Design a protein around this ligand. Structure first.
Ligand SMILES: Nc1ncnc2c1ncn2[C@@H]1O[C@H](COP(=O)(O)OP(=O)(O)O)[C@@H](O)[C@H]1O
Ligand code: BEF
Ligand SMILES: [Mg+2]
Lengths: 617, 107, 95, 86, 93, 87, 98, 108, 93
DNA sequence: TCAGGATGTATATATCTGACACGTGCCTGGAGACTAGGGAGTAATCCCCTTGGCGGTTAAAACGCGGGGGACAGCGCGTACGTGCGTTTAAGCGGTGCTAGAGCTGTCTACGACCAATTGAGCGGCCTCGGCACCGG
DNA sequence: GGTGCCGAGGCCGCTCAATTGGTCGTAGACAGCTCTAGCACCGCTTAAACGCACGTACGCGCTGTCCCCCGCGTTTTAACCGCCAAGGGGATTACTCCCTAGTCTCCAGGCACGTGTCAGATATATACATCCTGA
């Protein structure tokens, strides 16, 4: 087991590393930050000051750590607090590099204006003509802070690496989960910065070795070298049995040793215990029935691997799960089914608009019951989806009911993104919904004005969806938050959702059970850790349960809502009785060749030739 | 037991037995499968029958009874497939197809 | 008399129907033996060896004249020039 | 008895003979400088085939050039000939 | 000595498609050359098909792939079916 | 309303007019008619499907599902277009 | 009036730079989509190695460059400097690709 | 019983032993002579040297020290003998020989 | 697995003619395929040469004649000279 | 545009001969039955690398304007090729004899395949340094 | 010019493939002899080549017109590279059996050899189809 004769080597490097347990790492302690940190406008929360304590302690002890708070607890302000503190108490100006995602760059700029106006900063972005304008200022060194994006740290390394950086800060440090990341190679080699920090809400994703890559970047060899990469786990363990997470004989101490190893430099803080006044954030998963068009398409793609087409016959798509995922979302994404139904269903061909989209996909059917109801209670709902091709289909259906929506996607102009955030967050705003992509809209954004979140489809890893949920569940939210994760009954999405659920267990062993808040030092960790084993058993499989009446119960947060919610529900029933058209597809128009379903000849005789005129007369 | 040739057993007119020997003696591989000579003799018979049909038709159109090299040339070069197979082949005493450019013809 | 060019078509129509060799045999055979002396002396030819060379050589030349004729037409001419032979051999890859 | 070295036998490829070859190729009208150009083309072509045929002949340690020698020489030039064996 | 040729087999095939039409000596010599040429085109390509795949046997599978490579388009389809039927009738009885 | 324009690409049109001119410059031509671009797309298409058909035949013979570089090399050597530099 | 080059001198500018280079002159992605589409006709569910597609593009440009070299002589032979589609058909027919 | 490679006793830098193996494995004939690999390896070594020095000369003429496919292309296509040997061959990343027709370039 | 090539032998020849120049990786694979091409071109002709004369062995004489048939002109004269020199040296030693 | 005359093309009939097609003996190569072995079919496992999707920059592509270089039609000239007649040369033929060289048969022996031990050359993997690009001028 | 760094040159450990050594038997070499096909001759018709000259059709150079192609600029688009994810196949390995080479024994299809005779020129006599000229 030799767990002991591994930490001792760690104790060496902190000693040697410091020269140029927890206590030897934290040699210098300075409890002075409680004073009024000046050049500010707002006031820090009580715990944020404690976070600043942990931050300046790393500065004194010459350490690099991870501000792995939860995904709404003012991580931008805490970093700004450190910058202002160093400029005053340590009196060092420094250049203070900061790396942020593109959509967050406007937010970071705004925070400096209202929290530290005296700090002079350059927002390094724009076309190459704009970016060479900053070069004279950079060489003079008059700036104090520089904000860039992951892209410009690679594109403009030849002029950014020249500056010696008194402190490097990287926001949303998920980008470094890959060790062979091009950003890591450029950052550690070309860029010199003694004092590096990471901000993240999900310190480790699906795999355990990814967290090592973050630590290896922060502390290259002093943490532990890459060449000598001997591990506590020594092997990845991931099987249906969750109570075992390593090749050991049901041993809990091995996990408890990791918590001790990375305790000195990591600061997790939970939303529940740190900030209890936020509302509950209840989460719901609601299934969806498959339309007749989807059911026939999903069957053949899963069985034969082919998409059904017209006689103009089948096409063989390539990534089977990806195609099945698209079918479950909307069968018009393939643009071959849409065009054929553009003609046959009766109206103009090509681009298709109407109640067919209402009826084509089970997920859209359920939205049109939900969205008008949410319009009544004046709730603003922000909606995430994975594929951009789905948004365009989603965008047309939103015009048919005339909803007022904004769409912040990838491939939207960087200049426009800041405005879109402003208009939606405006008080008295007229916009009802705000289309987002998971990858571009899921990162640091303050969409606090929305109270409910619809997750149209789930990602392969769950932490991507957890970022999406917490775009509204942040500091500054006063309304109850409800997350409505759509799903499809008896489809691959359950396998995706269940596989994601399995990845949620590895971090809960390592990060969640650690409780790196410096207050829970007591033995509650083992009380927490052993409580993880028994709740695995109590799960029971659930299928084929749309729960037609329960859905409005799931939206509603008060009884007076039901009084509103029980009006339009019956009105749709009475209105639909006049013209009896199935709410779903329900085999109505499947007479298309899809459901209709389910040169080369012989030798020496068949060869068809043309008469030849050998006569020549 | 009565001896029955492999050509008759495969229903061919070409010598399956001889084709087998030519493959072994030709240094094409260390081993020759049992079905390889049969398959190859059938393909050779097909191509022979395909060209002789067209040549026989060319002989008939010229009111002749015997095939001559001219008729083989007419059969091969008029067929689209056979012309590509025998693109780099020249046939002795075959001549050329009667073909005159349109621009050369009188106005 | 006949207008110039009408006998040429009559010759074209005639020779494209026949198949015999278009070169006298003795002049060709003497040419073959002259070339062979440069390589080895006191050689000796089978009768079919010379006939094989003649069949190959006249098929080469007739096929070349078909190619040089298209180059002549391509330049809007009906007379084939030496420059037309050279272009045909260039495209084929003999130059 | 004494072999006489043949000379200037290319001129045996007469002007009418070249015209007949041109007619079979569909040529309607021939320039005057074609004839010397053709004699050069025939000579170059015909030396290449003789060179290989003699190479095949001397390798077999023979003193006569057979039809197989010519057919094998032609097949390397990329131009197979049917009707002489092989 | 004796010289081998496909003369009698070509003549047998001729009488199945044109029972009245005959063949001249020079034409048979061309047909004999045609069969020999095509045989070596198939066998040579099948030879290096086995070499590319590190096999040491040429089978009816190697012959069929060689036919598909050499014969042009629709002509290859009939040759493949002709060969498969022969090997099928040969194996069964 | 932009979904219709993406499918009307006809990826043979991916061989753009400037790309064809770049090939023509390396071939040394100075002035190009406007009908070359359509003509040279057909010439490339015919050339590719001859080589692709032979490369796939080699692949299918070997029980593989992936066209390797040797399949392309072997196909080109069969058309007399030997290529050096891909093993 | 802005400075404008005479016609032809910019087209001839390739001599100094753009005929001594050796990179591929067709974009990678459009070519690769074309290769896969052609292969759909012969076999479905086919995969290509990355180096397999490069070999096809390497041979394709060498073919098209070599064809334009022959097209250019068929144009000059007809006393003009503009290549036309009738020049490609003449060049290919002489090579025997018709 | 001391081992001396057949390449050394023939004064070659090419593997006579390996070439002898390739002949026996390639189904070229039933038997392989003893002098056939020595003769064949010598020829292959000569052809390699001819290309290598010609490519090396083109490397200096660009004031470069390494051989790249461009230099192999320039060496082969400039020499009329190697060009005829490699007429049907395409060299990847080779480029073309710089050549402009006389008519195209301006001539006052 | 172990894959054989001519890389080291080509590099030995390179340092004989240009002791200082190096060779890139792509240029090395181009040279490697060139040697394979010429090898099977000569070996293929010599094999066919021995079949024509009803021999069953490949000797240096077939290798010599194949060089004349394949290599053009002045290349063949020098290649024959090198091959003859190597065989006499090998036989004497 | 139609009529006439001249030349040439296409037509029906004897007849004739040399090659196609048939029959015969026979020898050698193919078919039938056996045995011994190893090539390859088959199963199972590992993990490389292929495929589809999004994100965000920016260079290339696209669209349009505008001018002039070049393609094409037309016309006039004059040279060189085609047509035909008459003269000259040498090919095609049918013999004939000479003999040289290819083919065949029989011995004989040296060389190359086969096998079995043995070790070092050649390959994969690794450090390390510099040739070459590149960012500016 | 200078700085940078990715690709190449160089070093080491580990096999497996080349070398050495014998043994065998068969392919290849040699001599002798046969006979046939190629080389050379002759004389002869006579068809093909040569030569001369006339006119005429065509190559060719010039000119003028016009419109298509080039070049430039502005905006737009998608290739490119960076990144996410999952799993289909491309390799290996091990086992084992069945197919193929190899042998001997028949034995009959196919080859060379003669033989008979008929299909396809070749030559005669003839009414129509094509041009060249006139109108
Ligand atoms: N002391 C404070 N006063 C006002 N607002 C705060 C304070 N601390 C945090 N916030 C709010 O919390 C939100 C999150 O800030 P940020 O540093 O981005 O944390 P995260 O990265 O977890 O979202 C911001 O919208 C900010 O307005
Ligand atoms: F944690 Be916040 F979403 F930056
Ligand atoms: Mg943040």
């Amino acid at each position: 087991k030799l767990i002991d004769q591994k930490k001792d080597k760690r104790l060496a490097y902190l000693l040697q590393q410091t020269d140029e347990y927890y206590a030897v790492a934290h040699a210098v302690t300075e409890r002075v930050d409680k004073q009024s940190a000046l050049m500010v406008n707002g006031v820090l929360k009580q715990y944020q000051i404690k976070g600043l304590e942990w931050l300046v302690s790393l500065y004194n002890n010459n350490l690099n750590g991870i501000l792995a708070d939860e995904m709404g607890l003012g991580k931008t302000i805490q970093t700004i607090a450190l910058i202002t503190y160093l400029m005053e108490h340590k009196r060092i100006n420094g250049p203070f590099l900061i790396i942020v995602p593109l959509s967050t760059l406007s937010n970071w700029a705004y925070e400096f204006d209202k929290w530290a106006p005296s700090v002079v900063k350059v927002s390094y972005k724009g076309s190459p003509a704009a970016r060479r304008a900053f070069v004279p200022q950079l060489r003079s060194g008059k700036f104090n802070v520089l904000l860039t994006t992951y892209e410009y740290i690679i594109k403009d390394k030849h002029i950014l690496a020249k500056i010696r950086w008194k402190y490097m800060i990287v926001d949303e440090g998920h980008r470094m989960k890959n060790h062979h990341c091009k950003l890591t190679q450029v950052l550690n080699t070309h860029y010199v910065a003694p004092r590096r920090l990471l901000l993240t809400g999900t310190p480790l994703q699906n795999k355990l070795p990814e967290l090592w890559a973050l630590l290896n970047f922060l502390l290259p060899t002093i943490f532990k070298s890459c060449s000598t990469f001997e591990q506590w786990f020594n092997a990845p363990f991931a099987m249906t049995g969750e109570k075992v997470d390593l090749n050991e004989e049901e041993t809990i101490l091995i996990i408890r040793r990791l918590h001790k190893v990375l305790r000195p430099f990591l600061l997790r803080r939970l939303k529940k215990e740190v900030e209890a006044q936020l509302p509950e954030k209840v989460e719901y998963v609601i299934k969806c029935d498959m339309s007749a068009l989807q059911r026939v398409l999903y069957r053949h793609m899963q069985a034969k691997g082919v998409l059904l087409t017209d006689g103009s016959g089948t096409k063989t798509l390539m990534n089977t799960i990806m195609q099945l995922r698209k079918i479950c979302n909307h069968p018009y994404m393939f643009q071959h089914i849409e065009e054929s139904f553009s003609e046959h269903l009766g109206f103009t061909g090509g681009i298709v608009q109407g109640l067919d989209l209402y009826r084509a996909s089970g997920k859209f059917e359920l939205l049109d019951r939900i969205l008008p109801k949410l319009r009544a209670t004046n709730h603003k709902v922000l909606l995430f989806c994975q594929m951009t091709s789905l948004m365009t289909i989603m965008e047309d259906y939103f015009a048919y009911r005339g909803f007022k929506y904004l769409r912040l996607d990838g491939t939207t102009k960087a200049e426009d993104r800041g405005m879109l955030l402003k208009t939606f967050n405006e008080p008295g705003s007229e916009y009802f919904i705000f289309l987002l992509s998971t990858r571009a809209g899921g990162l640091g954004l303050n969409l606090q004005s929305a109270d409910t979140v619809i997750i149209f489809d789930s990602d392969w890893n769950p932490h991507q969806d957890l970022q999406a949920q917490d775009r509204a569940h942040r500091i500054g939210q006063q309304n109850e938050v409800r997350v409505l994760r759509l799903c499809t009954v008896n489809s691959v999405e359950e396998k995706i959702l269940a596989a994601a659920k399995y990845k949620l267990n590895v971090d809960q062993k390592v990060i969640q059970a650690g409780m790196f808040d410096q207050k829970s030092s007591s033995h509650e960790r083992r009380a927490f850790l052993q409580a993880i084993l028994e709740h695995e058993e109590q799960d029971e499989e659930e299928d084929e349960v749309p729960d037609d009446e329960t859905v409005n119960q799931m939206i509603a947060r008060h009884e007076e809502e039901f009084d509103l919610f029980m009006r339009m529900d019956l009105d749709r029933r009475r209105e639909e009785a006049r013209n009896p058209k199935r709410k779903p597809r329900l085999m109505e128009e499947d007479e298309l060749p899809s459901w209709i379903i389910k040169e080369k000849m012989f030798g020496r005789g068949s060869r068809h030739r043309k008469e030849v005129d050998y006569s020549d007369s | 037991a009565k001896a029955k040739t492999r050509s008759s057993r495969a229903g061919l007119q070409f010598p399956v037995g001889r084709v087998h020997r030519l493959l072994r003696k030709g240094n094409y591989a260390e081993r020759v499968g049992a079905g390889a000579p049969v398959y190859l003799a059938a393909v050779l018979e097909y191509l022979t029958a395909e060209i002789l049909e067209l040549a026989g038709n060319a002989a008939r159109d010229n009111k002749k009874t015997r095939i001559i090299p001219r008729h083989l040339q007419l059969a091969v070069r008029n067929d689209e497939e056979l012309n590509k197979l025998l693109g780099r082949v020249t046939i002795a005493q075959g001549g050329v197809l009667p073909n005159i450019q349109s621009v050369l013809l009188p106005k | 008399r006949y207008r110039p060019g009408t006998v040429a078509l009559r010759e074209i129509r005639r020779y494209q129907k026949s198949t015999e060799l278009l070169i006298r045999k003795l002049p060709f055979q003497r040419l073959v033996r002259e070339i062979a002396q440069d390589f080895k002396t006191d050689l000796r030819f089978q009768s079919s060896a010379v006939m094989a060379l003649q069949e190959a050589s006249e098929a080469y030349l007739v096929a070349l004249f078909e190619d040089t004729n298209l180059c002549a037409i391509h330049a809007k001419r009906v007379t084939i020039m030496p420059k037309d032979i050279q272009l045909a051999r260039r495209i084929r890859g003999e130059r | 008895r004494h072999r006489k070295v043949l000379r200037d036998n290319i001129q045996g490829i007469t002007k009418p003979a070249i015209r007949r070859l041109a007619r079979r190729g569909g040529v309607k009208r021939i320039s005057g400088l074609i004839y010397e150009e053709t004699r050069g083309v025939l000579k170059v072509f015909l030396e290449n085939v003789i060179r290989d045929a003699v190479t095949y002949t001397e390798h077999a340690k023979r003193k006569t050039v057979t039809a197989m020698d010519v057919v094998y020489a032609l097949k390397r030039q990329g131009r197979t000939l049917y009707g002489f064996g092989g | 000595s004796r010289k081998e040729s496909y003369a009698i087999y070509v003549y047998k095939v001729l009488k199945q498609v044109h029972p009245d039409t005959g063949i001249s000596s020079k034409a048979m010599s061309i047909m004999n050359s045609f069969v020999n040429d095509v045989f070596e085109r198939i066998a040579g390509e099948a030879s290096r098909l086995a070499h590319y795949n590190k096999r040491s046997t040429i089978t009816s599978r190697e012959i069929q792939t060689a036919v598909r490579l050499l014969l042009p388009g629709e002509l290859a389809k009939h040759a493949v079916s002709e060969g498969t039927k022969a090997v099928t009738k040969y194996t069964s009885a």
